[PDB]
Symmetry: C6
């Protein structure tokens, strides 16, 4: 990444290379892989981000959809920040284009220069915006199950049911407002009759905690 003593380039740690590859091996594209990708790529250059992306042996369909999202993001970047053509002023910083931010056309030096400049041209954090927006499209994609098919078994503890509902809501990339709101509607509707009957009795303004105790 880029880190502090001044701001200096550091080699991506075997610890970190490993941790990303194991997390993709174990959790595939489970929602919780995104906040963890972000965490393992703290202070990462575009070369670091390609390195983590490029170390994944499997999921080559997911990786390809990702190149697509990144071409589009690189394209939009070039539409909003066109770069001067012809020779760069000797010994001076040239502006980054989309493929420079993605790390396919920039060098580590170039990338270093952009991120360590005052004020910084933050190509690490910009590309990781691109990659993560792409990584979420893959999560919703690989979301196996609809929130409509998440219903409570007759003998299933309410707590186990709510875990599947919200795990599903999370993979289905539902906005926080539908997550705050999901409680008073589908969570109740989708509950079994014994529980459903308890929850209806509470009425509106019941919390998840109040809901989850009522049916424990």
């Amino acid at each position: 990444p880029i880190v502090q003593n001044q701001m200096v380039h550091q080699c991506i740690s075997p610890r970190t290379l490993n941790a990303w590859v194991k997390v993709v091996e174990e959790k595939a594209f489970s929602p919780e892989v995104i906040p963890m990708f972000s965490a393992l790529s703290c202070g990462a250059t575009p070369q670091d981000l390609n390195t983590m992306l490029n170390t994944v042996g499997g999921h080559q369909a997911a990786m390809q959809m990702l190149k697509e999202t990144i071409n589009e993001e690189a394209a939009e970047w070039d539409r909003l920040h066109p770069v001067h053509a012809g020779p760069i002023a000797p010994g001076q910083m040239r502006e980054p284009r989309g493929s420079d931010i993605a790390g396919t056309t920039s060098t580590l030096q170039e990338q270093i220069g952009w991120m360590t400049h005052n004020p910084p041209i933050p190509v690490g954090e910009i590309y990781k915006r691109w990659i993560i927006l792409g990584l979420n499209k893959i999560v919703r994609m690989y979301s196996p199950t609809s929130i409509l098919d998440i219903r409570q078994g007759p003998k299933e503890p309410f707590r186990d049911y709510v875990d599947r509902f919200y795990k599903t809501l999370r993979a289905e990339q539902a906005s926080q407002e539908v997550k705050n709101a999901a409680t008073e509607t589908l969570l109740v509707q989708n509950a079994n009759p014994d529980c459903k009957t308890i929850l209806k009795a509470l009425g509106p303004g019941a919390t998840l905690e109040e809901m989850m105790t009522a049916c424990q």
Copy 2:
């Protein structure tokens, strides 16, 4: 987190990301996960705390009750510390609101600035107060068993019994004063007749050690 050389932002370590995720995988919401959460989040920014929270794939019902506790804590914060509306003085620190402390509306820079200021605006330690108060509500919730149903088997060693009692008392979030006091009452009542008879003989002012030897 934020650490010392001056006070400087450091990348949350793969060691730490892993240790929190394994501890939730293994112990779920066993009481002892709280002091360990706190320990793994030493010097943590709100972004670090969201990162650890967001890396948990399971327990999405628990996570949702937690958003609730945090909205309430963010709300109370705004009720006591309202923030000036309109443009911030150029190049100056704006006050944090509830959602700034929770890390949903602040940036790492903003969060850095608050915690590294003299004297510090300690948003790491404030949000971790919020998260932990929420994490305890989940522990009592997921406390399977009442202290009334913790009784000593006829053939069960007193020591094994006291382990379940106090493990239970801990998950049931009983105050230290009921823990000091629990000895002279329920611990004896809930003991088996052979042991109960020994303990009654000791009378009052007997320690747990004296109690636990008497019945070994």
Copy 3:
């Protein structure tokens, strides 16, 4: 803990949090857990010591006897070092009471200030004296077996027998003088007749090595 560059507060390492929790999981309250507790808590604040104590999910009976030992040690502390009541001089160090040393009433800052002062008020090392004196009471308690019931099988190698004897002597918290002395008496008496006969032949002034060769 508190460590050196000046003397500075450092975050308890995931390595260390883990190592203590694994050592309690594996060895429970085997004597050798004490010197290891001490080692893992090198330079530890009272908050670090509570953190290691509080991370133990099991042994809640042992933990409760420990609160007892610590209340008594905190009480004795207050009996010998009473603290001035009323407002602390602005910007000045207030004296620590028993519950300040135990970390239930002090803050990390307060604790930092005490230990980093010239000369230091060493609350880390004082509380760890308290905790360890309590942890030994638990070892003797959870000592399953008397040195009188450690006797050599007819077919058991003398070396295997002496391992059980001294392992037992150690859990039974016998003073070093009874350990130096245990050789010329019970070790011989408790040995089997074939070995006993050899050892008696040596007479007094025989070492453990001479004893252990004689019977190999």
Copy 4:
């Protein structure tokens, strides 16, 4: 490698020695081993690169093809950058030849001097260009399967099929332009009739995501 405090030689870490040897043991010459080799050899001297190469017990046929690629690259280097023969000016840097860049004729000191010079003679990064160009020839070689034999089973989920296609395309070292393009042609042709029929309906200008949803 060579790292920063100035730029200083550091011992290749047991962590790194291990991580390369495990990655060759587990993944052999799967494409994703290349970006990972590169990552584990960050700031590496030619001696570091030989060290990682030389620690591989297996794949001695692959290693031998690699000596070949490196002799050719060393040869081309000498064809373009011939070195002055006879005595080097006392206390001065001599130019590197091909076998100096490969690390068979240079010393660590010599290699250090080249890479730490202003501006640097970057023999670490030059040899790793050589090694990696050789390592890709081995990947295409050890590519078991043609993209023509990657066809979708009647009962095989489209997503599983696209994973094999692009994993294959990657081992077969197809250029990014054939990867962008592979979608509108062979991916469809090679799909099963039920899916093929859906994809044909979309027509041209369909993305992989649109393709992959259409057939989910």
Copy 5:
């Protein structure tokens, strides 16, 4: 231990605490545990050395023979370096006695002061001389087998035989001169007739390599 930035006290690492305890668990008192003990106790204080010794749950007979060796070494120390009795000059370094070097009567501060002084009073390295001389007495003790009972099976490869011979010679603590010499005598005598006959043919001045090839 004591390490450098000046010379400073460092906390014994969980890595090191663990590595010693695992090595005693796995290899017991196999000769090769000594050079490894020494290595794990690099820069160690007497408190560090007691800590590593005290963390061993098993082998309490071995540990007790070790207290004996250390009392004798502490005694000899006091016989050669008697210490002035009565009050130490205020703020000045008092001389170390045997039990001060063993760490039973010294403090970490006292021990720090001795080892960090110019020139150093090297109590770490002196006690580790004591402990290691004691640890070797335990190795010869726990040497199961005589070099006279190490003989080559009729069907046993000479190389396998020489491994047992020299492993035995090592546990039996034979001096290097008997190891240089052991070849021309017992190694041949103890070999089987087919091999013995080959080795006799070589005559004197044959190396182990020449011996070991002759019989491969």
Copy 6:
């Protein structure tokens, strides 16, 4: 080893002690253990090198042949660099003899002084030349199989065959010139008739890659 901040002695890491002992446990004297020994002993003193050597419990026949190689290398050293006899000039560096380089007669201080001097007397790198030349003699020794007995099975993939050939060539310590050359002769001769026939067709000037594709 000896490392940089100046050049300073550092304690051999538990990581490194472990990594060498595991690599001998797993790979015994497979050729690839040599480049790995070298790597784990980066900046190592003679005491570090003895420490790694001395931590190996097994292979005592190999270790003994190694003492032999080192006595010979120490002897040759003394034949070429005889040392002045009688008292060393007070406070001055005495010259190293063979047994000083091997670390049997030198001290860590003495060894430190030699390696940290300007210009350095490089006893770490000299002894590791000795040890490695000895370690290769052991590899050829423990080479089970001749390159003449490495022949391709009728049904064995050419690639699998070439792996055994070159793995064998490597253990048999054949010079690089016989490795470059081994292709046009024995590799073909030793191949099976179906493959042999293909390879003969190529004629001379065929690469291993061309050879290995021809027969895939």
